[PDB]
Design a protein around this nucleic acid. Structure first.
Lengths: 70, 144, 128, 158, 214, 109, 192
RNA sequence: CACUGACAGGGAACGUGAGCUGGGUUUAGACCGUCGUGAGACAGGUUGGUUUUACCCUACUUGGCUGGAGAUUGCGAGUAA
RNA sequence: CGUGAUUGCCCAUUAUUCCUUUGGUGAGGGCGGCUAUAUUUCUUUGUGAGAAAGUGUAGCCCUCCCGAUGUAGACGUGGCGUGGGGGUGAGGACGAAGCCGAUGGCGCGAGCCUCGGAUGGACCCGCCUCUAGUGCAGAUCUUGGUUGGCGUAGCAAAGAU
RNA sequence: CAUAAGAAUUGAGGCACCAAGUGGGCCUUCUUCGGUAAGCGGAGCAGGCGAUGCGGAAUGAACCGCUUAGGGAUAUGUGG
RNA sequence: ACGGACCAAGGAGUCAAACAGACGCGCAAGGGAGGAGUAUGUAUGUGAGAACUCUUUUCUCGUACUGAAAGGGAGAGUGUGAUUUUACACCCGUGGCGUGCGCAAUUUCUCUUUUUUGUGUUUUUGCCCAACGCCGGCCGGCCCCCCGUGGGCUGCGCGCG
RNA sequence: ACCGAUAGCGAACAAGUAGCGUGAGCGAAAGUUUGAAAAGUACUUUGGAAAGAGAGUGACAUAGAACCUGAAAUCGUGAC
């Protein structure tokens, strides 16, 4: 009759039901959050940049409609 | 309706599908709100976080009518406005006339970019209309 | 499929599946129900048993709700309705809903035999 | 059930072992980094900060970060039915670049370098052999085996 | 008990609206127990002059001649004492339902009494329960001309909302065209069709994994 | 019990004063309403009939009326404005006889 | 000896002896089902399939988000192909933002009254898919609009161990001040 | 203590209550000593204090009290020397 | 010699194989207004007899395939019953309904049908929708009832005809 | 993507919504603790049983074999 | 271990708010009236809680949120100039993905068809990711302090109804 | 769009009766001849008497006042 505590058996069986997941790990990209602030400040300045690439996504659009519209 | 109920599907069956284990008689094992703190904690905390305590501040006998709602943002208006208007006035040589009241509201907060200067007999505005209405040569008339 | 010919029997049984001990309690009746029965050997498909009905047994879907004389009995109360049947020889025999009083049978019967198309009523036991 | 410090100890693991005592080398410090490095984790002792809990020595993860004294490593920790990425705040002293990956890439490029050379660079250039095989044999003196007990009085336990 | 309800207004109506069309989607109407050998224009649209007819017989007769015989004769005569207990909760008799005249309003004599479910309606009604026996639509409306015409004013049109119900009207079809099936047959479609199969029956292996003469 | 993912723990009628085999009690259904409607109607009409020479509704003022939410709105309000009535000229008592309301607690802003 | 199924008898998931009560659809599907498979057209098939789902699963789309599509024409080609076909299996609702935007052709389940009109009125075209398909078999210069999904509110009501990672709004009873939200917007009570 | 060849030990739901009996046991009453603030307690002491049913099944005893199988025939040859 | 008498076996829901069943995010197809596809099969080494021969074939049918025990628990029904509504079957005293039926049969079943009265005797039922005080062995169930128990216990005080 | 030299798989993957039913277990190879011990107690791993029957162990919850549509035909399993 | 002598008839998962999902169902930034009230004959009745409705006023909830507050408040459009207080212009914020659409090679096909190949390209409302950006918010940054080029922490916010 | 005589009010019934309890109070059980009706079985005859057997009635008494039906449990019988 001594009243047993607990255990772990069945568990890898349970764990393996639904498996062992990671999630496409590096999602394709990170999960965000945190870092070293002097680096983080600098990276924004090289993502300033994004408005440059949006005018590169417009550069091509203009080229197609200025070469000829025929 | 009777026929849909699980019951129909669930007779000859004791438990009512409740589990053969769990001969859970017709009682709470819980009961209403409370006990949230001991035996339901994790849930409680989790699913209804910000509860209890009370803090910030209060306005006794508050009379909420008095605040009763006022807000609209821009393009919104034009739509209310006759399309004729909205497909015309643009130039500034015809400012169609909008009385906020019918629209309800009272306050104007930004947004929109419209498609005709017009007059809004309007009661309050964000910063933006000085930069929007005004920028547009659209118009606010505040009420008096 | 049946006849002529498959390579074996057309059912594995059809003697009705009932409770068990029906036979025992007289207020107990002979209808098939699933044993619940916690220790039930009947559930547990222990050997000693009787059978239950299951989808493996099923009659060939092609070959089912088909009579002995090869027709599904089709319910009928009247001659007009019967007059519709005419095409059929494949899979129906009209069965007169006997279930509705007679005089009309005198009419139906007359027309039907006259019309030369089967009805079991009109074809069974000692009279036609 | 047991006591729990977040630095709860061990018998023979943390202790700084076999002549391996004392500060990290200056070589350790001269190292240099970049991020995304797959580096493995170890525990000095040295300073009892920037020092992971137990999970972590003998595990390889990837750095996501370089801070003054330290580096950020995200590691996948296996919980229940998953591994979660944990980003851990070590000062630099407790981590190092493997070879785990190094080879793969190293080879891959080297090979490519060769594969490329081989077409499309100048030269052409043998490496390896296949696997394993058969063969002619002209041996010249086989033996056999005769084991135990003869001249066992010369030997065996007492 | 929730012996009671809402219904959405657009919806209640909309529904009826489908129904109204299907009051004249004739097959349906026929299918509906409605019969008329008489059958001709669907709906069979009738003088509003009829409405003034003051002798039952006179009225009915024409009505019979013009239609009412079978369906009508199902009527009155499919009248049975409600078998079962509803009878004994006072539902003593039951019967089916037969063809509908809609009036703009009634002005005959009799007028047409002594018969309900054999409809007469002052237009501004239309009660679905009368329209859909058993909720299974299809009834014959027999028009007074004045109802008939008034009707349209009542529903406005698609693209002309406004009636007496405010905007609620004939409104969008979904697919615009039935006989889709016909459509589906096409030629364009029928061109881009993709070709088929051949070489059928009798098996290839005809068992025998073992060699032989087979 | 069934598995359905629905809208958490609810439904309400299985609460207080819904008279059970007990008794109680605070009852006030609206099922009377048809009847009631009729009661309003049938009466109303029937009333008319009786009164009959009379124009029914009794003149009252017009007002702009309350609030913010109502700041912008007008309703024909209670009463009148003796002052106005005065201003048109009319003895209030008499006005009452004419069947035009009166008031006082219209202070007349 | 059977062995693991990766889940046995593979779940509804994406569905078959199928959905809603509108008659037409039922045709449509018969129509279209031939077309994608037996007029080998992924587009058609897609269409076909796409037809099948439930309402959520057909959450609408709206106009200005098509504008863009008719900016696409504009960065497409100099323009030999000079035409384009929009699809939406829902209703097209009006948008607002532009509303001086051009005409064009949209192929939808439903266009609001207003929209329908105004679109059409603006030279647009509202074609129902019957009005499409038939006279549109095969894509090419087709533009699937796959709706949206996301911006429902429901998901809002997914999440509440309000850690610095979870930022999500519960289905609770304050519609005003406190009533279950007393801190968090202060750091302090019942922490974070 | 006494007898005695002999005064072995055990088993049988610690055999053995529809066997008794109730002295033992354990309520209630009641005394004491102790203990307990207390009520109370006490495996302390003490004392008096409601022991049912068989007609049944089976089981046991006596008492009565009735056959034979079946096979080519249970279709017939009524030990076998 | 070189094998050879010649054949070592017996026997689970496993296995094979084969059929039928069943489900399946399953495969095919035919899915035409006479070319074709199922049903039935000859004359029967190279035939659909479009024309040898009857019968079926409007989105389903017709072929193919893998898998197929499962408590708790869940889900499904072009699942099953019933009471009652609405529609629709105008079903019948030439005896309803009820009821009995080593009555048969149909359906895996759930039922459902049928044929009987040496039955019973007037109201009652189908089908589609609606809708439910909706489908019992047990509850130390309940009310009624019904036993066996068993002519057993037993009828044995108060003196006796 | 060769090596010249060193996988296999992959009867999909991705991804998600939401509700149940459960929380006393028990049995085992293996490791192992308490105590003489205990069909004892008490953990670790895997597997079972539980919640399945079939076939085997004259007898057995958990041992052997093996799991199950319904059958049919065949051959095996353990075991003889 | 308990309960269970027998047979009839009973005999137990209900109604119901807000609410979450699912699904059908309506319409859609509105939607839902809603309380009511009017309202005219079918003709019992009638000028239908329930018939038909039918609806001006709208009401009510919904169609920006954020702050305790005081309180503010979203194309911080995009783009643009921009020393962008402004001022201009006025048919996709930035990247990763994208059923798709395009192009070429690729098979046959006359050509078509066009199998097959090879690519291109395209809004992150097709989904999600990833990063600004944006509203209220907070620290007000940078700096010795404070202000401006510009900050810089944060949130049920916003990002093409 | 209720229940159907164990239902349904307690109570379809001379029922809130009867009954029960000191009393407070507690407070039941209990339905239908007749295709039409008593036509309610004369008469005979045995039989103390009941009664029986006849008869006689009535479509029907397997309808004779236990009246519609007449379920099941239980039992005799027949029959095996």
């Amino acid at each position: 009759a001594k009243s047993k505590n607990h255990t772990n058996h069945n568990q890898s069986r349970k764990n393996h039901r639904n498996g062992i997941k990671p999630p496409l790990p590096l999602y394709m990209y990170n999960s965000k959050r945190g870092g070293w602030l002097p680096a983080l400040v600098n990276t924004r300045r090289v993502r300033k940049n994004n408005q440059k690439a949006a005018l590169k996504a417009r550069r091509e659009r203009l080229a197609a409609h200025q070469a000829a519209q025929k | 309706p009777t026929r849909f109920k699980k019951t129909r599907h669930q007779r000859g069956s004791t438990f009512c599908g409740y589990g053969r284990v769990g001969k859970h008689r017709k009682h709470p094992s819980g009961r209403g709100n409370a006990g949230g703190e001991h035996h339901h904690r994790i849930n409680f905390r989790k699913y209804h976080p910000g509860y209890f305590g009370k803090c910030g501040m209060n306005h006794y006998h508050k009379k909420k009518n008095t605040t009763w709602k006022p807000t609209i943002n821009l393009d919104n208006l034009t739509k209310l406005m006759a399309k004729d208007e909205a497909m015309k006035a643009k130039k500034g040589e015809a400012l169609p006339v909008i009385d906020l009241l019918a629209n309800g509201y009272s306050k104007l907060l930004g947004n929109g970019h419209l498609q005709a200067p017009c007059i809004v007999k309007a009661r309050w505005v964000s910063k933006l209309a000085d930069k929007k209405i005004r920028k547009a040569g659209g118009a606010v008339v505040l009420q008096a | 499929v049946k006849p002529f010919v498959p390579r074996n029997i057309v059912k594995k049984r059809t003697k009705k599946f009932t409770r068990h001990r029906c036979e025992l309690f007289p207020q107990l009746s002979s209808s098939w129900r699933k044993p619940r029965g916690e220790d039930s050997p009947v559930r547990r498909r222990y050997k000693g048993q009787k059978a239950m009905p299951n989808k493996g047994y099923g009659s060939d879907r092609r070959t089912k709700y088909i009579t002995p004389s090869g027709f599904k009995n089709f319910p009928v109360n009247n001659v007009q309705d019967l007059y519709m049947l005419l095409m059929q020889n494949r899979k129906y025999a009209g069965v007169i809903s006997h279930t509705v009083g007679a005089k009309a049978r005198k009419a139906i019967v007359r027309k039907a035999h006259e019309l030369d198309v089967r009805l079991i009523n009109g074809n069974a036991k000692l009279r036609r | 059930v047991h006591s729990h410090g977040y630095k709860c100890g061990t018998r023979h693991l943390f202790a700084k072992k076999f002549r391996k005592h004392g500060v990290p080398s200056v070589s350790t410090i001269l190292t240099n980094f970049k991020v995304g490095d797959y580096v493995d984790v170890v525990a000095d002792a040295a300073v009892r900060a920037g020092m992971p809990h137990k999970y972590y020595h003998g595990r390889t993860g990837i750095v996501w970060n370089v801070t003054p004294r330290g580096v950020g490593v995200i590691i996948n920790k296996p919980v229940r039915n998953r591994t979660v990425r944990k980003r851990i705040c070590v000062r630099f002293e407790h981590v190092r670049k493997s070879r785990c990956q190094e080879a793969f890439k190293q080879k891959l490029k080297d090979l490519e370098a060769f594969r490329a050379a081989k077409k499309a660079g100048t030269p052409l250039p043998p490496k390896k052999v296949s696997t394993r095989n058969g063969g002619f044999v002209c041996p010249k003196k086989v033996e056999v085996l005769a084991r135990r007990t003869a001249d066992y009085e010369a030997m065996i336990p007492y | 008990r929730r012996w009671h309800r809402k219904i959405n207004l657009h919806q209640k109506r909309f529904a009826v609206v489908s129904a109204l069309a299907a009051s004249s989607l004739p097959a349906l109407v026929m299918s509906r127990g409605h019969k008329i050998e008489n059958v001709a224009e669907v709906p069979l649209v009738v003088e509003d002059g009829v409405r003034a007819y003051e002798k039952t017989k006179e009225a009915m007769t024409f009505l019979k001649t013009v239609g009412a015989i079978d369906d009508v004769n199902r009527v009155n005569d499919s009248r049975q004492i409600r078998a079962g207990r509803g009878k004994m909760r006072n539902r003593r008799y039951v019967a089916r339902r037969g063809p509908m005249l809609v009036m703009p309003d009634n002005k005959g004599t009799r007028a047409f009494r002594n018969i309900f479910g054999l409809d007469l309606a002052n237009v501004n009604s239309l009660n679905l329960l009368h329209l859909a026996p058993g909720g299974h639509v299809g009834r014959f409306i027999i028009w007074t001309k004045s109802a008939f015409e008034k009707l349209d004013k009542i529903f406005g049109t698609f693209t002309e909302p406004s009636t007496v119900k405010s905007g609620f009207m004939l409104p969008a079809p979904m697919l615009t065209s039935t006989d889709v099936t016909r459509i589906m047959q096409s030629e364009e479609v029928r061109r881009v069709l993709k070709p088929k199969k051949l070489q059928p029956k009798r098996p290839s292996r005809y068992r025998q994994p073992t060699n032989g003469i087979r | 019990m069934p598995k359905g993912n629905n809208a958490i723990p609810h439904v309400h009628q299985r609460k207080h004063w819904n008279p059970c085999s007990s008794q109680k009690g605070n009852v006030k259904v609206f099922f009377n309403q048809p009847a009631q409607k009729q009661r309003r109607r049938r009466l109303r009409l029937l009333k008319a009939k009786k009164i009959f020479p009379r124009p029914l509704k009794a003149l009252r003022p017009q007002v702009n009326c309350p609030t913010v939410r109502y700041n912008m709105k007008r309703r024909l309000g209670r009463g009148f404005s003796l002052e106005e009535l005065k201003a048109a000229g009319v003895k209030p008592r008499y006005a009452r006889t004419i069947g035009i309301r009166v008031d006082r607690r219209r202070k007349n802003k | 000896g059977v062995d693991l199924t990766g889940v046995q008898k593979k779940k509804r998931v994406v569905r078959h002896h199928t959905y809603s009560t509108n008659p037409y659809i039922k045709l449509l599907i018969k129509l279209y089902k031939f077309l994608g498979k037996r007029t080998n057209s992924p587009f058609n098939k897609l269409i076909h399939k796409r037809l099948l789902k439930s309402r959520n699963n057909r959450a609408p789309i709206s106009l200005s988000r098509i504008a863009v599509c008719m900016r696409r024409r504009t960065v497409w080609l100099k323009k030999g192909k000079k035409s384009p076909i929009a699809v939406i299996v829902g209703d097209v609702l009006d948008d607002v933002r532009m509303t001086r935007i051009p005409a064009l052709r949209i192929c939808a389940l439903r266009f609001s009254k207003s929209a329908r009109e105004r679109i059409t009125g603006a030279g647009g075209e509202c074609l129902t898919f019957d009005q499409l398909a038939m006279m549109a078999p095969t894509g090419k210069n087709t533009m699937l609009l796959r709706g949206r999904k996301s911006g429902r509110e429901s998901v809002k009501h997914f999440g509440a161990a309000g850690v610095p990672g979870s930022h999500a709004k519960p289905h609770v009873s304050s519609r005003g001040k406190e009533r279950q939200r007393s801190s968090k917007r202060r750091h302090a009570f019942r922490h974070k």
